[PDB]
Swiss-Prot record, chains A, D:
Source organism of this protein record: Sus scrofa
GO annotation, cellular component aspect: mitochondrial inner membrane; proton-transporting ATP synthase complex
Oligomer status and interactors: Component of the ATP synthase complex composed at least of ATP5F1A/subunit alpha, ATP5F1B/subunit beta, ATP5MC1/subunit c (homooctomer), MT-ATP6/subunit a, MT-ATP8/subunit 8, ATP5ME/subunit e, ATP5MF/subunit f, ATP5MG/subunit g, ATP5MK/subunit k, ATP5MJ/subunit j, ATP5F1C/subunit gamma, ATP5F1D/subunit delta, ATP5F1E/subunit epsilon, ATP5PF/subunit F6, ATP5PB/subunit b, ATP5PD/subunit d, ATP5PO/subunit OSCP.
Similarity field: Belongs to the ATPase e subunit family.
Originating gene: ATP5ME
Part of the intact protein present: 3 to 59 of 71
Molecular function as annotated in GO: proton-transporting ATP synthase activity, rotational mechanism
Protein name: ATP synthase F(0) complex subunit e, mitochondrial
Chain coiled-coil ranges: none
Main localisation: mitochondrion
Curated annotation (Swiss-Prot), chain C:
GO CC annotations on file: mitochondrial inner membrane; proton-transporting ATP synthase complex
Location within or outside the cell: Mitochondrion; Mitochondrion inner membrane
Function: Subunit f, of the mitochondrial membrane ATP synthase complex (F(1)F(0) ATP synthase or Complex V) that produces ATP from ADP in the presence of a proton gradient across the membrane which is generated by electron transport complexes of the respiratory chain. ATP synthase complex consist of a soluble F(1) head domain - the catalytic core - and a membrane F(1) domain - the membrane proton channel. These two domains are linked by a central stalk rotating inside the F(1) region and a stationary peripheral stalk.
Source organism phylogeny: Eukaryota, Metazoa, Chordata, Craniata, Vertebrata
InterPro entries, per the entry: F1F0-ATPsyn_F_prd
Disulfide bonds: none
Signal peptide stretch: none
Alphabetized UniProt keyword annotations: Acetylation, ATP synthesis, CF(0), Hydrogen ion transport, Ion transport, Membrane, Mitochondrion, Mitochondrion inner membrane, Phosphoprotein, Transmembrane, Transmembrane helix, Transport
Name of the protein described by the UniProt record: ATP synthase F(0) complex subunit f, mitochondrial
Topology with respect to the bilayer: Single-pass membrane protein
Source organism superkingdom: Eukaryota
Subunit-structure text: Component of the ATP synthase complex composed at least of ATP5F1A/subunit alpha, ATP5F1B/subunit beta, ATP5MC1/subunit c (homooctomer), MT-ATP6/subunit a, MT-ATP8/subunit 8, ATP5ME/subunit e, ATP5MF/subunit f, ATP5MG/subunit g, ATP5MK/subunit k, ATP5MJ/subunit j, ATP5F1C/subunit gamma, ATP5F1D/subunit delta, ATP5F1E/subunit epsilon, ATP5PF/subunit F6, ATP5PB/subunit b, ATP5PD/subunit d, ATP5PO/subunit OSCP.
GO terms under biological process: ATP biosynthetic process; proton transmembrane transport
Bilayer-crossing regions: 57-74
Length: 57, 93, 83, 57
């Protein structure tokens, strides 16, 4: 036997839902490049360390 | 030189006059824009949804097909008006 | 009370009625271009105090004409790719 | 003298507005990485062309 929403909450819910959906898409977009670049430059660093131990074994 | 600088001071007074003339025309635009200091009422939502359903009624049976052109032209132009705001939101994006 | 009316007067249901009551022969094409030119002329030009707007329209029209003519050769330098 | 909205349109407008705001944020997020990577790989390609004309001048 469903119990009708005290409408305050039925309002408060789905709004916040879509707020969070937007927040998530925004975070994804805003964050991808920084991590991509930090990791790629760390890859430069690790290749350099590899060649270091190659010449400084 | 200094006279040109003095002319610039007069120009500054002229610029103040330019602001002075713009403000009443802007105030008339403000009178049209002063209707809402908070988001629109959810009171007429019923009227709008009911008008929408009445449009659907006029559509389903094929009765709106007795209209004249000018009316449909107007309707479509305001439809495209509403539409441009979608790209406007994209702009915000 | 009339078969032929201003295309704005006619309705959508009888839309094809108007489309079929009217003629299409090139003579009836000149006899349309003329009506357009003369409406413009006798409404915005042939008046004792004609203004800029009595002329500026055809200029800013020719402009858009020759812009459309050129659209092809301008898709090659859009500053942004994904529009 | 403002003219009250025929409410249909006052409804139709701001909805579409925020739809478009969401669409824009989503497009931004979804699109950034692909272009970043295509351009960076094109940079690999152009460095390769540079070294090509270096050795094949
Ligand atoms: C030989 C010796 C040679 C000597 C050369 C010297 C000149 C010789 C005599 C020619 C003078 C022209 C007369 C004239 O200008 O009309 C005023 C004059 C005054 O008319 P009025 O009705 O009595 O009063 C009007 C008020 O003045 C209206 O006042 P207002 O307060 O309402 O102001 C309205 C204004 C203000 O409103 C606005 O603020 C609108 C703002 C938005 C702008 C529009 C959008 C622009 C978008 C980009 C803007 C980004 C910024 O609206 C506009 O901005 C309209 C401009 C839009 C562009 C249209 C351009 C058409 C120009 C036509 C002028 C012809 C010049 C020919 C000269 C020869 C070549 C050098 O018109 C006449 O009385 C008769 C006109 C006779 C025209 C003769 C043309 C001969 C045929 C020429 C063919 C070749 C065309 C050449 C095209 C180039």
């Amino acid at each position: 036997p469903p119990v009708q929403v005290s409408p305050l909450i039925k309002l408060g819910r789905y709004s916040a839902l879509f707020l969070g959906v937007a927040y998530g898409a925004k975070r994804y977009n805003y964050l991808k490049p920084r991590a991509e670049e930090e990791r790629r430059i760390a890859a430069e660093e690790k290749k350099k360390q590899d060649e270091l131990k190659r010449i400084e074994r | 030189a200094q006279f040109v600088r003095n002319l610039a001071e007069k120009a500054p007074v002229l610029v103040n006059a330019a602001v002075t003339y713009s403000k009443p025309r802007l105030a008339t635009f403000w009178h049209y824009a002063k209707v809402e200091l908070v988001p629109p009422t959810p009171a007429e939502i019923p009227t709008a949804i009911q008008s929408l359903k009445k449009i659907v009624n006029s559509a389903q049976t094929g009765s709106f097909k007795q209209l004249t052109v000018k009316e449909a032209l107007l309707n479509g132009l305001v439809a495209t008006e509403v539409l441009m705001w979608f790209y406007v939101g994209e702009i915000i994006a | 009370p009339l078969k032929d009316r201003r295309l704005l007067e006619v309705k959508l249901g009888e839309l094809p009625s108007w489309i079929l009551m009217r003629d299409f022969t090139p003579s009836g094409i000149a006899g349309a271009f003329q009506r357009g030119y003369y409406r413009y002329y006798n409404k915005y030009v042939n008046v004792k105090k004609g203004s800029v707007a009595g002329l500026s329209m055809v200029l800013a029209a020719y402009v858009v004409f020759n812009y459309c003519r050129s659209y092809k050769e301008l898709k090659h330098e859009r500053l942004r790719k994904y529009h």
